[PDB]
C-alpha cells in the first residue's frame, strides 16, 4: 500500500482508524506497530478521556489509603 | 494579587546532513575519492540522530505528565474568576486560546531559503508531537487544576469548589480563610484586571519572547555559515571542482581535491560540536522547565522566588513555539503601618508569650495580631501560653490578660 | 572501538602503514605522506577527547542530581511535589549498582473516595463559624467536621471552630448548631 504523511511516504503499512500507544515513532503524530501478523500505522492516543463533576457545594473525600 | 509571565525554552530544531551531496556535489570522481577517508560520516549521522531523539524526549518529559485527559464542565462559574482567555476556544480550528494565538503570532516569485538549503544536503525533520497535542495537554492540565486542585498530581481527581481551594492556599501562605471569605469580590476584580493587563502587554509589547527568538537565530546563523563555507578555496585554485579537473593534470588536481575535502570535513566537525553543546544547554533548560511544571502547577511551593516574585498562590501553563510560558498568581502586601511591640507580657508574676501572632500597641492599649495582616484582638488565655516568671526576659511589659471563665462564674 | 578502527585510513597517502612508506621512498618525498598520516591520526584522537569531555559533563550533572536526591529524599522528608516519587512522600532507601544508584521510594496514595455536600461557614447565634484545621461535610441530614485527607467525622464544637464577624457577608453560609462543652457540666 501507499500512505502520505507529513514526514514523507510510507509503503508496506496499512492505515487503521483506531488509536494505541506509540511503539515505533514515524512522525507528525503517526506511529507504527506489528499486530493483528501485519504492520499497522496509526495516530497516537494521548490517554483516556475523563470528566470531573463540578458544582458549588460538592466535595470528594478519600476513605482508604495505599 | 499579581500575575507574572515567565518564558522557558524546551526543544530545538532537528536537522539532517547528507555527506556526499554537501562535499562532492554531483561529481562521480570526488565520490570515488571520498571513500579513502574512512568512517567520517556514520559518526555524524549517529550524533545528529541522538540529538533528534533527545528533543522528542525533552518535549515528552516536559508536557506529558497527566495520565487522563480532563475537560471543564459546560458551566463556566468559578467564584467570579473569568478564565475565559486561557481556556480553549472551540470557534477557531486550532482549539487554542487567545493568549496562545497572540504568542504564536508574536514569534515568526523568488526561492525560499529552506528549499535552497535543502538542495545542498541540509534538511529539517518534523517533530513527533503536533501543536494540537501540546494544546490538548495544556487544556487537560488547566482543567485538572481548576476543577480538582492539587489532588490530581498524587492520585485521583477529587472535586472541590474554587473558593475553598483559594482559602486553602491562603492558609498555606500564612493568612486565615476569613480574609478571603470577606474580600472575595475584591480579589476576583484584581485577578481580572491583572489578566487584562497581561492581555494588553502581550498585544502591544513585541520584545517579551527573546529566548525562543535567540534559539531560532542561532540555528539560522549556524546553517548560514555552514552554507557559506562552500565557497572558499582553502588554498586551491578555485572552489568549483570541475574547473580544477578540466584545467590541469591529475597530479596536482589530487592535491587540490584533498585540500577541499579536508576543509569541508573540518567545517562539518565544527558544526557538529557546536550543535552538541547547544543541545546540552537546551536539555538543561528543559529539565528546569519540567521541574517547575511539577512544582508550581501541580502544587504550592514554599521556595522563595521560584514560582514568582512574592508569596506564591498558583500557576497556569501555556504553550509557545519551542517553549513554554508560565502565568504565576502571587500575593504581595501593601499599605503598611508602624506599631510598638514587646516580646512578652508580665501578668500575675508570670510571663505570657503569643501562640501565633505578635503583640502590638496603638498608643494606650495592647492587642495580638496575625503576622501578615492587621487584625487586632484582645489578649486572653486562649491565644497565649505561659512559661516562667517575668524577671528574665529582656523588654517585658505590664498589662492584663482576660480569662473567659470568671465572668461565667458570676453570671 | 571506532578510535581503534580509524587506524586503517589512508588520508590520501600511498599506504596505511609507516614501515613500507619508509622502505620505498627517499627522505625528500616520504615527508608528505608521513605528515598526512600524522595529521589525520591527531585529528581523530582530538575528536575522541572532545566527545569524552562532553559526556563527562553530562555524567557530572547526573551525579549532582543524585547527590541532591540522596541528601533530601533519604536523610529527610521532602515536601516537593513529584521529587521523591509519585504521591505523598513517606521515606526512601538507597541501593548500589554498577556505575549507579537505585532509590526505593515509599509513598502514600489515597483511594476509595466518596461524595459529600459542604458549606464554607456556619451561622449560629448571629455569628459566623469557620473550621480550624478541617472541613465541613454533611451526609444529607446532619453536619460534621472532618480532616482533609482522611474520613473521620466529628461533632462541631467550640474547640474546633473559631468565630469572626456576622453571617451576612459570606456566600454559601448555612444554619446549624454549635455545641458548647462548658454549660452541660456547669448545669449538672
Q: CA-to-CA distance for B241 and B76, rounded, in angstroms?
A: 69
- Going by C-alpha positions, the residue among B389, B397, B384 that lies closest to residue B348 is B389
Nearest CA in chain A to B160: A59
Q: Do B156 and C9 touch (CB under 8 A)?
A: no
- Going by C-alpha positions, the residue among A43, C175, C181 that lies closest to residue B133 is A43
* Separation in Å, CA C175 to CA C86, C119, C127, C129, C158: 40, 10, 10, 10, 16
Read off φ and ψ for residue B345, nearest 5 degrees. -115, 125
Resolution (angstroms) stands at 2.9
H or E stretch at C103: strand C100-108
- Other CB atoms within a 10 A radius of the CB of residue B64 amount to 14
Q: Do C61 and B284 touch (CB under 8 A)?
A: yes
- Looking at the partner chain, which of C137, C150, C172 has a beta carbon nearest the beta carbon of A62? C150
Read off φ and ψ for residue B180, nearest 5 degrees. -65, -45
Q: CA-to-CA distance for B410 and B402, rounded, in angstroms?
A: 15
Q: Are strands B311-320 and B397-398 parallel, antiparallel or unpaired?
A: unpaired
Side-chain-facing half-sphere of C142: CA atoms under 13 Å: 7
Question: Which residue of B72, B95, B128, B155 is the best one to mutate when testing the A interface, meaning the one whose CB has the most A CBs within 10 A?
Answer: B128
Q: How far is A58 from chain C (nearest CA, A)?
A: 5
Read off φ and ψ for residue C104, nearest 5 degrees. -105, 120
**Interface partners of C (3+ CB pairs, < 8 Å)?**
A, B
Task: Report whether B181 contacts B168 (CB < 8 A).
Answer: no
Question: Which residues, in sequence order, are bridge partners of residue A45?
Answer: none
**Interface partners of A (3+ CB pairs, < 8 Å)?**
B, C
- Going by C-alpha positions, the residue among A63, B160, B66, A59 that lies closest to residue C110 is A63
Contacts with B376 (C-beta within 8 Å, 6 or more apart), sequence order: B360, B362, B367, B368, B369
Task: Report whether B114 contacts B124 (CB < 8 A).
Answer: yes
Q: Do C9 and B284 touch (CB under 8 A)?
A: no
Residue A47: helix, strand or coil by DSSP?
coil
Task: Burial-class residue B329 by CB neighbours within 10 Å (0-12, 13-18, 19+).
Answer: buried
CA–CA–CA angle C95, C98, C104 (5° rounding): 25
C-alpha grid cell, residue B106: 508574536
C residues 142-161 closer than 8 Å to B (CB): none
Q: Do B159 and A52 touch (CB under 8 A)?
A: yes
Question: Which residue of A4, A24, A50 is the best one to mutate when testing the B interface, meaning the one whose CB has the most B CBs within 10 A?
Answer: A50
Q: Do B276 and C8 touch (CB under 8 A)?
A: no
Task: Report whether B181 contacts C129 (CB < 8 A).
Answer: no
What's the farthest any 2 CA atoms get from each other in chain A? 56
DSSP count for chain B of H helices, then E strands: 12, 12
Question: Which residues, in sequence order, are bridge partners of residue C97?
Answer: C100
Question: Which residue of A56, A59, A66 is the best one to mutate when testing the C interface, meaning the one whose CB has the most C CBs within 10 A?
Answer: A59
Residue for grid cell 521510594: C105
Q: Do C81 and B181 touch (CB under 8 A)?
A: no
Q: CA-to-CA distance for B86 and B91, rounded, in angstroms?
A: 14
Helix pair angle (B177-204, B162-173), 10° resolution? 100
Q: Do A58 and C151 touch (CB under 8 A)?
A: no
- Going by C-alpha positions, the residue among B97, B71, B20 that lies closest to residue B264 is B20
- Taking contacts as CB-CB distances below 8 angstroms, the residues of chain B near C185 are none
- Other CB atoms within a 10 A radius of the CB of residue B111 amount to 8
Task: Report whether C83 contacts C103 (CB < 8 A).
Answer: no
Read off φ and ψ for residue B317, nearest 5 degrees. -95, 150
Contacts with B324 (C-beta within 8 Å, 6 or more apart), sequence order: B7, B8, B10, B62, B63, B289, B293, B317, B318
Sign of the CA dihedral B179, B183, B186, B189? positive
**Interface partners of B (3+ CB pairs, < 8 Å)?**
A, C
Q: CA-to-CA distance for B162 and B140, rounded, in angstroms?
A: 17
- Quick check: B37 contacting C, CB < 8 Å? yes
- Other CB atoms within a 10 A radius of the CB of residue C25 amount to 15
Q: Are strands B345-347 and B397-398 parallel, antiparallel or unpaired?
A: parallel
C-alpha grid cell, residue B191: 485577578
Q: Are strands C122-124 and C174-175 parallel, antiparallel or unpaired?
A: parallel
Name the interface residues of A facing C (CB cutoff 8 Å).
56-66
CA–CA–CA angle B246, B248, B249 (5° rounding): 105
Q: Do B37 and C86 touch (CB under 8 A)?
A: no
Q: How far is A43 from chain B (nearest CA, A)?
A: 11
Q: How far is A38 from chain B (nearest CA, A)?
A: 23
Residue C124: helix, strand or coil by DSSP?
strand
Question: Which residues, in sequence order, are bridge partners of residue C131?
Answer: C161
- Taking contacts as CB-CB distances below 8 angstroms, the residues of chain A near B64 are 46
Name the interface residues of A facing B (CB cutoff 8 Å).
6-7, 25, 27-29, 44, 46-62
- Quick check: C187 contacting B, CB < 8 Å? no
Question: Which residues, in sequence order, are bridge partners of residue B393?
Answer: none
Question: Which residues, in sequence order, are bridge partners of residue B329?
Answer: B3, B314
Q: Which method was used? A: cryo-EM
Q: How far is B23 from chain C (nearest CA, A)?
A: 16
Question: Which residues, in sequence order, are bridge partners of residue B345?
Answer: B352, B397
Q: CA-to-CA distance for A40 and A30, rounded, in angstroms?
A: 10
Q: CA-to-CA distance for C59 and C66, rounded, in angstroms?
A: 10
- Taking contacts as CB-CB distances below 8 angstroms, the residues of chain C near B299 are 81
Contacts with C120 (C-beta within 8 Å, 6 or more apart), sequence order: B163, B164, B167, B177, B181, C130, C136, C170, C171, C172, C173
Name the interface residues of C facing A (CB cutoff 8 Å).
108-119, 135, 137, 146, 148-151, 172
Q: Do C130 and B178 touch (CB under 8 A)?
A: yes
Residue B226: helix, strand or coil by DSSP?
helix
Q: CA-to-CA distance for B384 and B379, rounded, in angstroms?
A: 8
Residue C114: helix, strand or coil by DSSP?
strand
Q: How far is A54 from chain B (nearest CA, A)?
A: 6
CA–CA–CA angle B74, B79, B83 (5° rounding): 60
Q: Do C119 and A58 touch (CB under 8 A)?
A: no
Q: Do B70 and A52 touch (CB under 8 A)?
A: yes
Amino acid at each position: 500500500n501507499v500512505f502520505q504523511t507529513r514526514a514523507g511516504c510510507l509503503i508496506g503499512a496499512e492505515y487503521v482508524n483506531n488509536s494505541y500507544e506509540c511503539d515505533i515513532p514515524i512522525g507528525a503524530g503517526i506511529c507504527a506497530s506489528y499486530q493483528t501478523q501485519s504492520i499497522i500505522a496509526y495516530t497516537m492516543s494521548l490517554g483516556a478521556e475523563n470528566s470531573v463533576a463540578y458544582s458549588n457545594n460538592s466535595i470528594a473525600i478519600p476513605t482508604n489509603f495505599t | 494579587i499579581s500575575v507574572t509571565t515567565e518564558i522557558l525554552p524546551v526543544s530545538m530544531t532537528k536537522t539532517s546532513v547528507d555527506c556526499t551531496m554537501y562535499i562532492c556535489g554531483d561529481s562521480t570522481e570526488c565520490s570515488n575519492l571520498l571513500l579513502q577517508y574512512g568512517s567520517f560520516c556514520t559518526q555524524l549521522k549517529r550524533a545528529l540522530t541522538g540529538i533528534a531523539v533527545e528533543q522528542d524526549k525533552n518535549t515528552q518529559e516536559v508536557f506529558a505528565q497527566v495520565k487522563q485527559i480532563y475537560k471543564t464542565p459546560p458551566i463556566k462559574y468559578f467564584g467570579g474568576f473569568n478564565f475565559s482567555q486561557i481556556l480553549p476556544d472551540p470557534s477557531k480550528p486550532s482549539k487554542r486560546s487567545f493568549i496562545e494565538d497572540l504568542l504564536f503570532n508574536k514569534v515568526t516569485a523568488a526561492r525560499d531559503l529552506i528549499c535552497a538549503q535543502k538542495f545542498k544536503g541540509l534538511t529539517v525533520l518534523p517533530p513527533l508531537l503536533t501543536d494540537e497535542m501540546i494544546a490538548q495537554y495544556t487544556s487537560a492540565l488547566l482543567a485538572g487544576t481548576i476543577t480538582s486542585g492539587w489532588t490530581f498530581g498524587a492520585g485521583a481527581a477529587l472535586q472541590i469548589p474554587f473558593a475553598m481551594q483559594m482559602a486553602y492556599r491562603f492558609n498555606g501562605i500564612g493568612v486565615t480563610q476569613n480574609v478571603l471569605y470577606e474580600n472575595q469580590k475584591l480579589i476576583a476584580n484584581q485577578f481580572n484586571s491583572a489578566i487584562g493587563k497581561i492581555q494588553d502587554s502581550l498585544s502591544s509589547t513585541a520584545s517579551a519572547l527573546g529566548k525562543l527568538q535567540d534559539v531560532v537565530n542561532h540555528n539560522a546563523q549556524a546553517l548560514n555559515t555552514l552554507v557559506k563555507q562552500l565557497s572558499s578555496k582553502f588554498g586551491a585554485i578555485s572552489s568549483v571542482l570541475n574547473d580544477i579537473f578540466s584545467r590541469l593534470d591529475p597530479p596536482e588536481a589530487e592535491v587540490q581535491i584533498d585540500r577541499l575535502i579536508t576543509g569541508r570535513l573540518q567545517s562539518l566537525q565544527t558544526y557538529v560540536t557546536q550543535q552538541l553543546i547547544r543541545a546540552a544547554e537546551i536539555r538543561a533548560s528543559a529539565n528546569l522547565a519540567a521541574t517547575k511544571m511539577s512544582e508550581c502547577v501541580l502544587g504550592q511551593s514554599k521556595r522563595v522566588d521560584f514560582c514568582g516574585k512574592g508569596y506564591h498562590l498558583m500557576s497556569f501553563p501555556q504553550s509557545a513555539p519551542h517553549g513554554v510560558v508560565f502565568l504565576h498568581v502571587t500575593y504581595v502586601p501593601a499599605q503598611e503601618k508602624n506599631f510598638t511591640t514587646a516580646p512578652a507580657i508580665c501578668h500575675d508574676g508570670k510571663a505570657h508569650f503569643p501562640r501565633e501572632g505578635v503583640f502590638v500597641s496603638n498608643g494606650t492599649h495592647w492587642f495580638v495580631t496575625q503576622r501578615n495582616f492587621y487584625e487586632p484582638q484582645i489578649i486572653t488565655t486562649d491565644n497565649t501560653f505561659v512559661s516562667g516568671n517575668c524577671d528574665v526576659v529582656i523588654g517585658i511589659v505590664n498589662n492584663t490578660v482576660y480569662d473567659p471563665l470568671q465572668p461565667e462564674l458570676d453570671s
